[PDB]
Amino acid sequence: HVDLTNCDREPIHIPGYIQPHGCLIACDNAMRMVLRHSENCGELLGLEGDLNGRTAEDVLGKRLVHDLRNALTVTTRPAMLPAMETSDGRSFDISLHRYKSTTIIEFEPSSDTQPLGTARKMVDRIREADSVESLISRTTRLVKATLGYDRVLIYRFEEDGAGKVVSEAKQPELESFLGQYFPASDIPQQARALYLKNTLRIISDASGTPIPVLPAVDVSGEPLDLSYAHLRNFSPIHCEYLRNMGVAASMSISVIVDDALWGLIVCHHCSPRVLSMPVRIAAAMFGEFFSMFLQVLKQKRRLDTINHAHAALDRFLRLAAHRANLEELLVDSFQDFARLIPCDGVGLWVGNNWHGHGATPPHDAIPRLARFVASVSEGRVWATHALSQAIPEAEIYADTAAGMLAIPISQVKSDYLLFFRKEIVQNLNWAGNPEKSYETGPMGDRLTPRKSFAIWKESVRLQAQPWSEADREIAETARIALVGVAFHHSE
Amino acid sequence: HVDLTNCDREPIHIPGYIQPHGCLIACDNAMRMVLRHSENCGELLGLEGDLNGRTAEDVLGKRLVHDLRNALTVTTRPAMLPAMETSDGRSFDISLHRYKSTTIIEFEPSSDTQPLGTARKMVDRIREADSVESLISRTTRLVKATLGYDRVLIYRFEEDGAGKVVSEAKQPELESFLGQYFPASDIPQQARALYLKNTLRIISDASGTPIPVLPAVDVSGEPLDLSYAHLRNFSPIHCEYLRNMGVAASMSISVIVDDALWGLIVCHHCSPRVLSMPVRIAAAMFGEFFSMFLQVLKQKRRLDTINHAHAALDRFLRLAAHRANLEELLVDSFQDFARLIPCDGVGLWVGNNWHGHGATPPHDAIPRLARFVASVSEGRVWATHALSQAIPEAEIYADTAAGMLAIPISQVKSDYLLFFRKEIVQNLNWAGNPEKSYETGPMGDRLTPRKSFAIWKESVRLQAQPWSEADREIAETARIALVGVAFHHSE
Ligand SMILES: *C/C=C1/C(=C/C2=NC(=C\c3[nH]c(/C=C4/NC(=O)C(C=C)=C4C)c(C)c3CCC(=O)O)/C(CCC(=O)O)=C2C)NC(=O)[C@H]1C
Numbered sequence: 001h002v003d004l005t006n007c008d009r010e011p012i013h014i015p016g017y018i019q020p021h022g023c024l025i026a027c028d029n030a031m032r033m034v035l036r037h038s039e040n041c042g043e044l045l046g047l048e049g050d051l052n053g054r055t056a057e058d059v060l061g062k063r064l065v066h067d068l069r070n071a072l073t074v075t076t077r078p079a080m081l082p083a084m085e086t087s088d089g090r091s092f093d094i095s096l097h098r099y100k101s102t103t104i105i106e107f108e109p110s111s112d113t114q115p116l117g118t119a120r121k122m123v124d125r126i127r128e129a130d131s132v133e134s135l136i137s138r139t140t141r142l143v144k145a146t147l148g149y150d151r152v153l154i155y156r157f158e159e160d161g162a163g164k165v166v167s168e169a170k171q172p173e174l175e176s177f178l179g180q181y182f183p184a185s186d187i188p189q190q191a192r193a194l195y196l197k198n199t200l201r202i203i204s205d206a207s208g209t210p211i212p213v214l215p216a217v218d219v220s221g222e223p224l225d226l227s228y229a230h231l232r233n234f235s236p237i238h239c240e241y242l243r244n245m246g247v248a249a250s251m252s253i254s255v256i257v258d259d260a261l262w263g264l265i266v267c268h269h270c271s272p273r274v275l276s277m278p279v280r281i282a283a284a285m286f287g288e289f290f291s292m293f294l295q296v297l298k299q300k301r302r303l304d305t306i307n308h309a310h311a312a313l314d315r316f317l318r319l320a321a322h323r324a325n326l327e328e329l330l331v332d333s334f335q336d337f338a339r340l341i342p343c344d345g346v347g348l349w350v351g352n353n354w355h356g357h358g359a360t361p362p363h364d365a366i367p368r369l370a371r372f373v374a375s376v377s378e379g380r381v382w383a384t385h386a387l388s389q390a391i392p393e394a395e396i397y398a399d400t401a402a403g404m405l406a407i408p409i410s411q412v413k414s415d416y417l418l419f420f421r422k423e424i425v426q427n428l429n430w431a432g433n434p435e436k437s438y439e440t441g442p443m444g445d446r447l448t449p450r451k452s453f454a455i456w457k458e459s460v461r462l463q464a465q466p467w468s469e470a471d472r473e474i475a476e477t478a479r480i481a482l483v484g485v486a487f488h489h490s491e
Numbered sequence: 492h493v494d495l496t497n498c499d500r501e502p503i504h505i506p507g508y509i510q511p512h513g514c515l516i517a518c519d520n521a522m523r524m525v526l527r528h529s530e531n532c533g534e535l536l537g538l539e540g541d542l543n544g545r546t547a548e549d550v551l552g553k554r555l556v557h558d559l560r561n562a563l564t565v566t567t568r569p570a571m572l573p574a575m576e577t578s579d580g581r582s583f584d585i586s587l588h589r590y591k592s593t594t595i596i597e598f599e600p601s602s603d604t605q606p607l608g609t610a611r612k613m614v615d616r617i618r619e620a621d622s623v624e625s626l627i628s629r630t631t632r633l634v635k636a637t638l639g640y641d642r643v644l645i646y647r648f649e650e651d652g653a654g655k656v657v658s659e660a661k662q663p664e665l666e667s668f669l670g671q672y673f674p675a676s677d678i679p680q681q682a683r684a685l686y687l688k689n690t691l692r693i694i695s696d697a698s699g700t701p702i703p704v705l706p707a708v709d710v711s712g713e714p715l716d717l718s719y720a721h722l723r724n725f726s727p728i729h730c731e732y733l734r735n736m737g738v739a740a741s742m743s744i745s746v747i748v749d750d751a752l753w754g755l756i757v758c759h760h761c762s763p764r765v766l767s768m769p770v771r772i773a774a775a776m777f778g779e780f781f782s783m784f785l786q787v788l789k790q791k792r793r794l795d796t797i798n799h800a801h802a803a804l805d806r807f808l809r810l811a812a813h814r815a816n817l818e819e820l821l822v823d824s825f826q827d828f829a830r831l832i833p834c835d836g837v838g839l840w841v842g843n844n845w846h847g848h849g850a851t852p853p854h855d856a857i858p859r860l861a862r863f864v865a866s867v868s869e870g871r872v873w874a875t876h877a878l879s880q881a882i883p884e885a886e887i888y889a890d891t892a893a894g895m896l897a898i899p900i901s902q903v904k905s906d907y908l909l910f911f912r913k914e915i916v917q918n919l920n921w922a923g924n925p926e927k928s929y930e931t932g933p934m935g936d937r938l939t940p941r942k943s944f945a946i947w948k949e950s951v952r953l954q955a956q957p958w959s960e961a962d963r964e965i966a967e968t969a970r971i972a973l974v975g976v977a978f979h980h981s982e
């Protein structure tokens with residue numbers, strides 16, 4: 001039994017059911033015996049009675065079982081064998097994998113597509129992208145145009161597991177989710193684990209009748225682990241979510257960057273839709289290449305950002321050599337440091353005087369902030385995205401400054417360069433329809449984009465966009481530059 | 492009791508003794524009572540009998556104890572108070588710290604030096620260094636010339652904890668240790684922990700008589716933790732080591748880069764030598780600035796290396812667009828990839844054919860290597876610095892190729908770009924005297940640079956310089972570039 005109270009701990013990897021667009025035979029480690037089969041094995045393969053306790057060759061044939069064994073010898077990465085013939089001539093696309101010393105064989109009614117042909121075209125059209133923004137924009141349009149889904153989204157995962165819709169291609173009539181966030185809880189840990197293990201996740205029909213796997217549990221009290229099975233059935237919580245959205249079918253492509261789940265390319269259809277194995281092989285290869293190219297572009301962006309910071313700081317050090325009074329130069333220049341680190345406001349606290357630029361806390365609030373920084377900084381870069389958690393009084397000015405990064409600019413005195421960010425809801429660029437409502441099921445309106453967004457908004461109240469690893473790395477380089485030149489000018 | 496069998500686990504933080512160039516009073520958390528004192532407190536401070544069980548004001552005076560309390564209010568970072576007067580007029584330099592709710596007060600006969608003055612001069616002469624090599628070279632000469640020690644060394648710690656002498660300034664008559672390594676065991680874990688906690692480590696006189704702390708253990712069976720005490724006595728294992736080398740005095744400055752112990756600036760003197768507190772304050776500030784500047788230069792070098800790799804790969808991709816046959820271009824070009832990653836040889840394994848450049852394994856050995864790579868690679872970058880640990884047969888050609896980094900250049904076929912490194916002893920640039928022998932003590936010749944070096948050499952037999960994080964990051968960018976263009980050219 002699963003509901004909104006325990007769906008975070010739902011064992012979605014052992015659901016005991018498969019999707020009706022194919023049938024599944026479980027065999028022992030060596031493909032000698034048939035241990036489990038799907039109820040619909042009879043209909044598709046055209047066999048009669050129980051398949052459990054029979055031998056692999058008896059059910060499939062000496063010819064086919066020979067090919068399956070040889071594919072298995074040349075890891076849990078499933079082998080894809082299109083257009084395989086049974087004993088009685090019938091044609092099937094077959095997914096073959098071994099996991100927990102159990103051989104799983106998945107059967108699909110068989111296509112004349114070239115997997116590498118489709119993929120090469122798609123991969124050529126993204127390979128020449130020169131920015132993350134250009135890669136992400138074109139990929140949704142390209143995937144929508146090639147695979148013909150009603151909506152293609154890209155989610156990027158935030159540090160706190162939350163998802164942001166960073167790109168969208170859709171039918172004109174459908175409502176936009178572009179710039180909308182969902183909370184971490186909308187994709188449980190076990191789901192993220194499976195997204196990390198399988199490139200593709202197919203849902204052919206949300207309204208389809210799930211086919212049970214017999215037996216559900218074996219003699220030793222073990223369920224069949226469907227972690228790597230493409231026919232694995234979906235959570236009824238997600239089923240209701242898609243039904244509430246008017247979504248009948250989905251295909252997710254996992255984006256792996258630096259061996260972490262960066263996000264998903266997700267294709268939604270308003271009517272039932274399953275792609276054939278050859279199209280799924282193409283889409284998987286496209287996914288791998290999309291992931292690799294994004295990785296290199298992310299790396300390039302980082303290098304460019306850090307180089308820009310070094311250039312800007314060298315420019316400043318050149319000026320600092322010529323000016324006699326360093327404090328005068330900082331008072332004149334501090335706003336220019338806003339270029340180094342993305343921020344909504346910057347400030348200088350020097351000789352117990354304050355100078356502000358952009359969205360900063362109010363004048364009266366600063367001496368408090370400066371003392372707090374002095375106490376916790378310990379002559380190192382200090383940063384928080386949640387200022388009110390550190391200073392409850394800061395709650396009052398969170399709309400203007402919810403996050404703060406502090407850079408010490410003197411080894412001796414308690415002088416600081418302060419960077420500020422508004423609370424994240426202030427910087428929202430959401431292209432969705434707020435009047436658009438959603439039909440609900442038994443589980444309630446929790447399973448609607450509208451409530452998902454509302455819950456995320458509540459979870460980031462009085463919080464700013466967190467300071468990235470790059471932001472802190474640049475802050476540290478700036479600290480060393482300013483502390484160094486301050487020492488050269490000291491007496 | 493400590494010897495060569497248990498000196499790796501020697502509790503050097505609780506030795507029960509101090510060095511004779513100062514005296515130490517331990518007080519309670521609030522500096523109300525005197526719990527422990529050094530035997531030589533009587534001589535230096537000019538007091539009589541036992542100081543333990545007396546009150547702080549009774550022993551030092553209401554005036555001095557007031558100043559010590561107020562310094563303590565404005566963390567375990569010791570406060571440095573030069574030229575402090577006792578009740579009876581006598582002048583002392585005082586180190587004051589609180590650790591494990593115990594107040595430790597260290598007394599030195601008092602100097603008229605300006606700490607910031609000395610430091611500013613030294614720090615100005617290193618601030619303008621534009622390479623790690625230029626910073627490291629000039630620092631040994633500069634420190635030798637300023638602080639007047641017979642020898643100044645910089646050790647850089649290898650991944651395996653081993654130390655390399657990367658810079659040296661010495662008296663002409665002394666033997667050079669430049670390019671020499673010492674094994675990780677020559678500096679135990681507890682010693683590295685204290686080097687990380689204290690910027691400076693002083694040894695005034697290796698032949699000096701250690702002054703005991705009374706009581707050594709208190710009523711509750713607790714020793715005095717001297718972790719942050721500058722007067723803390725040194726291990727008799729290290730004492731014998733310095734004696735064997737002809738070293739009477741030492742001062743180490745800790746190099747902290749990215750919150751890790753990068754290495755030590757170490758000053759050796761052939762006669763006893765203690766610097767006054769003001770000179771030690773200057774040397775500590777110089778240490779902090781040396782560490783910060785090295786951090787930024789390390790960061791710059793990394794950026795330049797990765798940028799150079801991106802430029803080189805863009806150049807290659809431009810060529811790959813114009814050539815019809817990609818395999819011909821790789822056969823013509825592969826040696827040029829030697830510029831991306833430091834290596835002694837590079838090779839191409841394409842269509843079951845081998846092409847070698849520089850120090851590679853012999854022709855006959857390659858098919859074996861290629862199969863092994865194919866089995867473990869899993870279409871990812873594979874690297875080892877110890878090839879014989881992976882392939883025992885590789886032992887035979889270790890002098891030529893002890894380390895290997897493998898880059899897959901095809902998503903489909905098992906084609907590889909292979910980078911090789913000779914075993915590390917082949918690339919030694921040691922400037923030392925091999926005929927130079929050393930006097931030994933009871934503990935044996937283990938405590939000699941000669942045996943230290945010999946032990947390190949044995950520990951890295953059949954091993955190459957390990958592949959850095961930067962080497963792997965570039966290998967991964969190269970993989971994506973080559974796999975990408977190979978896909979564009981596939982059929
Ligand atoms: C407590 C458990 C919940 C839950 C579980 C699951 N979610 C799964 C998939 C899923 N969920 C979302 C969330 C969305 N939020 C939106 O606002 C929105 C649309 C605008 C969506 C789609 C996403 C994005 C996904 C990924 C797939 C997709 O995008 O279609 C999931 C796994 C499904 C599977 O087996 O493939 C589980 C389990 N979702 C909840 O909301 C809660 C309550």
Ligand SMILES: *C/C=C1/C(=C/C2=NC(=C\c3[nH]c(/C=C4/NC(=O)C(C=C)=C4C)c(C)c3CCC(=O)O)/C(CCC(=O)O)=C2C)NC(=O)[C@H]1C
Pocket residue numbers: 495497498499503646668672673676677678679682692724725726728729732741743757937938939940941943944
């Ligand atoms: C089993 C314990 C051993 C041990 C302990 C300690 N070593 C400490 C300091 C130390 N040791 C070395 C090693 C050197 N190897 C050389 O070849 C060489 C000279 C060319 C040296 C100096 C170094 C470099 C150091 C750092 C200080 C310095 O360079 O002078 C040590 C701490 C000392 C302290 O309390 O300050 C301990 C403890 N050393 C061994 O060799 C072994 C057996």
